[PDB]
Amino acid sequence: TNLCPFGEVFNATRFASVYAWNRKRISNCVADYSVLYNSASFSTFKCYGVSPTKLNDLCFTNVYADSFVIRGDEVRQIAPGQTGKIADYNYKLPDDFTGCVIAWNSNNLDSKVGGNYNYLYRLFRKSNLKPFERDISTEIYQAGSTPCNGVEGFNCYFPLQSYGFQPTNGVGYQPYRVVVLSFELLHAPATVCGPK
Amino acid sequence: QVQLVESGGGVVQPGRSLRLSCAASGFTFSNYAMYWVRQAPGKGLEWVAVISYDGSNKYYADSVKGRFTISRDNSKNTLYLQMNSLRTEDTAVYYCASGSDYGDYLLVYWGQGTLVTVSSAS
Amino acid sequence: ALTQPASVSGSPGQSITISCTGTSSDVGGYNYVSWYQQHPGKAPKLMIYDVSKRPSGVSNRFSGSKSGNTASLTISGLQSEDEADYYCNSLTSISTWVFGGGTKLTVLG
DNA sequence: CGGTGAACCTTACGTTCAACTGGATCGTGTGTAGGTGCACCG
């Protein structure tokens, strides 16, 4: 019954910045994870709340595919109960996550010479991020007790910082494309399971 | 296919200006970093210059530091190399490489490239 | 720069190896080498993408490999039409794209 | 095309109670180029 549009997500020309992670709904298809492989050298495929071996014998009300890019030393922060800049400011996953993440290196395809400024991450925020929340406001974040009326300068920085991806970066500093599939199931007809 | 055409330049006197233009088509020029690579007649290749995908950062080989200037304009999809204070040793054929998808640190397309001769004669 | 053999010769059919070496910064620490084949009077075109890979459309015979500080190309069943110059590239620190030098392949015709 | 001057969080780490006390040294370990260029004799 049709194949899930995993190409449109994994083969996508450009991934959104982590602070504006995309969200594509996938339903009314069959998840054939066999074809997912042989697409770059994956760096992580770890699933919580569901045994991968039986992934083909169960399906859900729907699944949400959130795609973004982060540096390797940061990918470990994409997991329930984790802490870090990404975990508290950009992308936060609930402790009861029912789904799992996929990460693969994209250095050869997503690291321009001299710095790729197309990708930004939120480095400052007043408070942590609630699970599955999106923030895109670029208001000037004051740090001290001196209001700056929205002017960049001393003790008042621009919240977003661009990732300086370069070919000569560290082994783990190179960009990593991350796609998180959140399997959401309720008392509704199932939508996305592969061959029995 | 992807085309890259160099304007070129005839024999010029040593220590005189010269503008070379590489015009590209068939791919997203404004999304990749071009390179200029020289080859002396009968010798091996030698990287000359590179410019970032938006012109913010430019890098030059030590041999041409402080004399060349690489720029680009995405409005008309062209790349320019300005040469000042030429030297006789600098005669060579210039290739305008692209660094296409699945690699930006590496040179891929290598358009036909033009020839530049630096001799003090008519 | 990098060091390469001045010339390599070989009859058609067998395996031919071409090796280039540099300091740790050029290739010993960075696995970004990529080799180009330039025919006489022609624009060089990529042959081995990355340390060991090949762009779509190139011959399957060519195969790149890396041994510690050295990088080598292996050609299986090379034909007469494979007679051309071969350069090994490498991305070093602070940019500075070094180049292999020169290596000519000939067939005992 | 260089000397100054004042900066702008400057961009790229080697890490988590924090922030700039409001110094280029400053708590833990920063650091700098271009220029904004307007006469030269050219």
Add this chain to the structure above:
DNA sequence: GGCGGCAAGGGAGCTAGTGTATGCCCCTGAGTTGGGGATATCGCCGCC
């Protein structure tokens, strides 16, 4: 013609289409993409 020894009874490898041991990613984790150890049935040949 029957016995005892054999890259073998426990070593090592990884790459998804799928077999019996130079295989099975078997079983999942340091996240850089991978760890050691699970039932041996074995099967075939030189020798005195």
